[PDB]
Design a protein around this ligand. Structure first.
Ligand code: SF4
Ligand code: SF4
Lengths: 193, 194
């Protein structure tokens, strides 16, 4: 697959697409159009205009298909990128949505939280809460294995769990204030002394 | 000169963002990635953490005798004495735009990076050309894309955010509306390619 990424050093999403490519050892050509001369900029825009008439950044060309804008799932779909986070995202969505627990709509935040669940599943053997420190002992951590014991009262009182991974329909659609959620876990559960 | 300790988790996103700011501003600190430590070292880092934050929550930053619990980057910066040209411009943009109904994106990290882009563009061009667009460097050719651009008002009225997602409406901010992708509204003929 021949990939070209039209990018700008000042464009945050352009750098995130580039980062994903580098991390997954994807073979691509990145054009940081703003680092070019006045005439090279004109030529980069003419090349871009042929595949994206709006001359907008980011734009990804994969062989003969073009993905315009911050459409990370569509870019992944044309390149053939499938990770265990994508798999777990689908599983969690199917299981939780009928229960009224929606995954946070900020996809980039939810994806890093799911990556945290996976990192915890590998090192501990269970999906310990990604925004808490686990002990590594399953029995001590039983109340913070996701979904934790605190999700139900936290979502009922504030509209979201402690990591903001699961949110209610009201939190999702802004019908309630998106309040900060305090740590409900009894501090004694660490068994420090 | 201040003694700084950041209690962090490798699985905590904001923890790495606080650490990134420290490193980029030469702020010396101890970073404890509590989850990388052994079983008994986890209990001791939690004992040190518990003394300053009984709830044993991450992130937690200790600056001398003052403790900041949670993702409170502004509070951390005020206690250390961090005050950058981005902070200055953020305040100027906030005071000028909030009374008009144009709020700065609540994802404070993304807003700061956009403001850094505005500053990078002011330095290399002489004006704050839109950081998510390609500037020519000719003010007259870029006139419609000097921040705030000619397209902010129609984009925010129709989608709730400007093209870069720097300025958002109150409904976008609180989640009352869907946060849709904003397409490039600029007529491509303005680029004067041929
Ligand atoms: S707070 Fe949220 S992310 Fe953490 S364990 Fe509970 S449900 Fe899972
Ligand atoms: S799209 Fe937003 S960030 Fe870009 S110039 Fe317009 S108002 Fe400024």
């Amino acid at each position: 697959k021949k990939i070209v990424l039209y990018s700008l050093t000042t464009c945050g999403f352009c750098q995130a697409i580039k980062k994903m490519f580098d991390d997954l050892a994807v073979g691509h050509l990145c054009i940081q159009a703003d680092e070019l001369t006045g005439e090279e900029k004109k030529q980069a825009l003419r090349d871009l205009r042929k595949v994206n008439p709006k001359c907008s950044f980011p734009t990804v060309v994969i062989d003969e298909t073009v993905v315009v804008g911050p459409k990370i799932q569509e870019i992944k779909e044309k390149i053939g990128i499938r990770t265990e986070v994508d798999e777990l995202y689908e599983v969690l969505k199917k299981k939780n949505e009928p229960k009224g627990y929606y995954l946070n709509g900020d996809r980039e935040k939810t994806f890093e939280l799911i990556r945290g669940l996976l990192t915890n599943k590998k090192r501990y053997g269970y999906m310990a809460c990604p925004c808490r420190l686990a002990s590594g002992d399953r029995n001590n951590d039983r109340d913070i294995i996701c979904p934790c014991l605190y999700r139900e009262p936290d979502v009922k009182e504030f509209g979201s769990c402690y990591c903001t991974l699961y949110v209610s329909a009201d939190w999702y659609t802004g019908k309630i204030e998106r309040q900060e959620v305090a740590e409900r876990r009894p501090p004694e559960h660490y068994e420090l002394d």
